[PDB]
Curated annotation (Swiss-Prot):
The gene is Kalrn. Residues 2-67 form the SH3 domain. This is Kalirin. It is found in: Cytoplasm; Cytoplasm, Cytoskeleton. The chain holds residues 1618 to 1684 of 2959 of the full protein. Interacts with the C-terminal of peptidylglycine alpha-amidating monooxygenase (PAM) and with the huntingtin-associated protein 1 (HAP1). Interacts with FASLG. The two GEF domains catalyze nucleotide exchange for RAC1 and RhoA which are bound by DH1 and DH2 respectively. The two GEF domains appear to play differing roles in neuronal development and axonal outgrowth. SH3 1 binds to the first GEF domain inhibiting GEF activity only when in the presence of a PXXP peptide, suggesting that the SH3 domain/peptide interaction mediates binding to GEF1. CRK1 SH3 domain binds to and inhibits GEF1 activity.
Length: 67
């Protein structure tokens, strides 16, 4: 796999791209990667919902840390 971390969406979002999905503010979904390559963005994947799902949005809508 690589690396997955638990993250919560700060704002609701609706898919649009291939690996995109509709999310809502308050839920928890594990992010795929980090904003190292991209500053200000974050991903969202669900594993507690078979089959899992994956998403893409900006850190504004995804729980982040920022160094």
């Amino acid at each position: 796999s690589g690396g997955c971390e638990l993250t919560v969406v700060l704002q609701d979002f609706s898919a649009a791209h291939s690996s995109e999905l509709s999310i809502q503010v308050g839920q928890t979904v594990e992010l795929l990667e980090r904003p190292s390559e991209r500053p200000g963005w974050c991903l969202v994947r669900t594993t507690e919902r078979s089959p899992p799902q994956e998403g893409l949005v900006p850190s504004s809508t995804l729980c982040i840390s920022h160094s």
